[model samples]
Structures are given as structure tokens and as C-alpha cells.
Target: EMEKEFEQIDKSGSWAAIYQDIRHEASDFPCRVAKLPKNKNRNRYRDVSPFDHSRIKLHQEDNDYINASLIKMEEAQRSYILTQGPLPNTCGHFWEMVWEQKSRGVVMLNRVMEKGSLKCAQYWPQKEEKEMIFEDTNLKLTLISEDIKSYYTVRQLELENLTTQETREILHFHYTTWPDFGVGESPASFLNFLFKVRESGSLSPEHGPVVVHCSAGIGRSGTFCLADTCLLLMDKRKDPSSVDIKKVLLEMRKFRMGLIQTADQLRFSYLAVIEGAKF
Candidate 1:
């Protein structure tokens, strides 16, 4: 039945063109992921406003601060908060927050094992004794930092393992802090990434859910997430009476902590969805 739904969903040039527009629109924000000071020794929480710090609850400890916040793009049976390591100890708290919202979903913790290696080691700590530290934690961690020839190769392996194991739901972490845009796997390459994911056959409803996150989990992550949401909305086109953008955005804020953190981010989301309304 889920496959049937995907079949009904059109994946023609229109979708491809729209993906292009989404990438083009994103160019306004020169930076892919918002930049934040990475001072591990300092109480970054006290450095910022009480109100702002309250959103992420970083006042508790320095390790509690996530490079980015979390945002809920869509309700799913399973989801993960994706990030590059070494995450601060404060990251544990963020996972706790995600668990609060997605109580039933698994939190697959992926990290690059080597300091400068391209391979992402999926959470199989046995290979290294140091990885054992995460085993006893409440978090459902999965390391995916393995050295692969291409981004698609890594993604395929991750998806394949999840699919065979019956953990189809996924939420990809996308940091927008990089600079490389040509429609490929990197943060800058938007169109190529979009097409690749859709073509992967892993996003089908039957498979599970996918989430995207970045620092503050709003700008780059929010833009991409919202683009997909708009496409889903367009596909349904049921009724505006039943739709509430504020409520929808608020939900994202609940998870991401401060999505649409600035007027600029809000403006971007608005423009991204409404730029070329040919639906």
C-alpha cells in the first residue's frame, strides 16, 4: 500500500525543477549552517541571553550544548538526530529532549571515528574499546562514520542496513556550514542531494520517516525540511482550512529549539515555499 502511494506520487521533471528552485532560493543564505562559537571550556550558555539559553536548556552544563538545535519535520515511528562529532557532553541532554518528543523512535548516533577520515563508522563500538563508553547509555546509538568512495555509497549502506533490520525510519543531519554548491552530496550541492535521496527508495512511507538537522537545526536544516513539507502539502492539496503554518512551525521549534531563530530565517522559509507557485 505504501509503495502504491509513492507510485501515485509524481517524480517527473517538475519535481526536479522545483528541487532546483529550492537550491537556488537557498543561495540567499551564503552560509550553509549557521556559525556558533565552539568554546568547550566556556559556559556558552551564560554568554548568551537567558531567554535564548532557555530554549536549548544549555545552562545545565557546557557539554549539553549541541552545535545545532533539533526540529521535528514530520511525525515518524522512528527518527534520529544526525550530527558530526566530537559532540560536547551536553549532547546527551539534547538526545533526552528528542526522546521526550519522539518517545518511540530510536536515536541513531553516527560519528566519524577518525579525526579527519571520510569514513563514518556506524555505531558498532566493538571495533574500538573507546566506543564502549556509549553502549550503556540510554540513547540508541548507531555509528555510521565509515570511509566510503561516495556519499551515495555510505547512504546506501546505512539505508540498506536499516531496511533489512526493519529500522527504515531515518532523519538525516545536514549542516549548512560548508561551501560547495553544484548539485551533489556536499552541503552546497543541493539539487543533487535531493534527487539522490528520492532515488534511494528509502523515504517511502512504508520504509519509515526521515529527519534533517543542522546547528540550531533551523536555517539549512529547516529550509530543506520545509521544502519537502511543501512538496508533500502540494501533493495533498486537501484544504487550507485544515492547515496551520504557525502550528506547524511551532512544532518544529519544539524539537529544533529555535527554528526560524531570526527574521531572516523566517523570510527564507516563506520565500522557499512560495517562490514559484506552479502547483
Candidate 2:
């Protein structure tokens, strides 16, 4: 049944048309449930707009706001904060968000350098780097350990409360290959990385929602969450054939705008979801 859907879409080359329709359907969405706070537009990238429904609300305790979304799926029992890559100015807010949210891991899908430009701020601590503190939030971020691989790098990060000296460990899962707004070369490679994250048990609910971001936090970020959610739903239902790919994407879009951004991304998402179920 799933293969037929893929076949039917491919047969007529309808991916573009269907994808366009979905895009148009989501055209009216806003940055947040209410208008964006009066100021602070610099935090938002030109292309990435945080969706109001799922966007993570910042704490007034520190008077900080980061451009990120919190998406929770009851059926799949999954929670993820999809946010834009930190702008240099917002690095403090980025770390502050992690500190306040108790996020155990950050799933970074984009490298800091993409092509000739900067797609994301170098938000994580470096091995040679000293402890970085965000005075605005009274938080400290330091690098503990970094495990590098052929296609990914996972780092152990310690986030501390400067005042009380309390600290938390955060795992930084960086997928090094995927280009900006592009899917990986194949589903096998991408799924392998995704599973590696799952194996670490970082995505589990015992901790706070996993923070997933790419360049804009919508394109690649959405694809990552959508793919994971569908795959987990299939696994939890104990029926690989029961997953509804289109419906799931739409449901998630309700939480964030422009999810599964391009038609290519949408198509790739379907491919990834189907391929992942074979396990």
C-alpha cells in the first residue's frame, strides 16, 4: 500500500504538484499564535519563521526569546523543539534555551559552514575553546568530550548555572554531510545517523524534548522530525503499513510553518519514512 502510494506519485511525477498544493494550503500560517513580540526580529532568519503553535516560549525570568518551536506528538509520544540555527547574536539565547528547557541533546543537521556562507552560528563549545558563559541568562557552556565520525560528530556538553554552579550534560549530535536545504545522498546513510541518535536514548522522554535544528529550523529540521515521527508511529503501532505519510506531515505542519519545505524534501521524506520501516 505504501509502495503503491510512492509508485503512483512517481508514475505521474505528481510529487511537485502535490507538494505545491500542500505549500499553498499552509500559506496562511503565522510566526506565532499571536503576532511576534513587538521587537526582536533579528533573531528570525529571513527564510526561517517560527510557527506559533509549536514554537518554544521563552521564560520571562531572564527576558530572553529564541526562535524555536516545541512540537509534541501524543500518539507517538514524541517531543521536539525545532528552531533556527543560532545567529551569532543569539548564541547566548541558544544556550539559555537549552538550559531552561533541560534539553538533553541537540540534533544539528547543518554544518556551521555551508558553501561560501554561514548557515548557522557555531553554537557548541569547541575542544580548544574555553568555557563560554552567557551572562544574560547566567549560564555556562563548556565542552566535555567530542566523538568525531566519518559522517557525524557527537559531543558531550556541560551546561551550568553560574549562580548555583549546578550543571547539566547535553549531547550534541551533528550530522556532517547533508547540505543546506538538501537531504542526504541516501536514506540508508541518513537513517543510520538517525538511529544512532535513538540508540543514545537522547530522544526518549525521560529527558526534555530533543532540540533539532538546521539552517532555518524549518526545512531540514522539519524533515528530520517528520521522518522520525512517522517511523516511530509505525514502530509503536506494530504495523509498518499503517503509517499515513501525508497525514502525518500535515499534522506536524499544524505546529510549524513550512515544514517539509520543498517538494524534493517532501518526496525525500516519504522515501525516508518508507525505507525506515523495513527495519
lDDT by residue for model 2 (25-138), tens: 664566643245643553655556666555676674744456787888889899899888887777877877787788898999988888878888777668637878777667
lDDT of 1 by residue, 1-279 (tens): 222222333433243443333334331211112233554422223222112322332333333443433333554222323222223443444444433333222222223332354222333232322332222124443434532323322221122121123322234332222323222122223433444455555445444334343333344555555544544554465653333333455544444333343443444444444431232
Q: For model 2, what is the alpha-carbon lDDT of residue 235?
A: 84
lDDT for position 242 in model 1: 38
The TM-scores of all predictions, comma-separated, are: 0.41, 0.92
Highest-TM-score candidate = 2
RMSD of candidate 1 to true structure, Å: 11.6
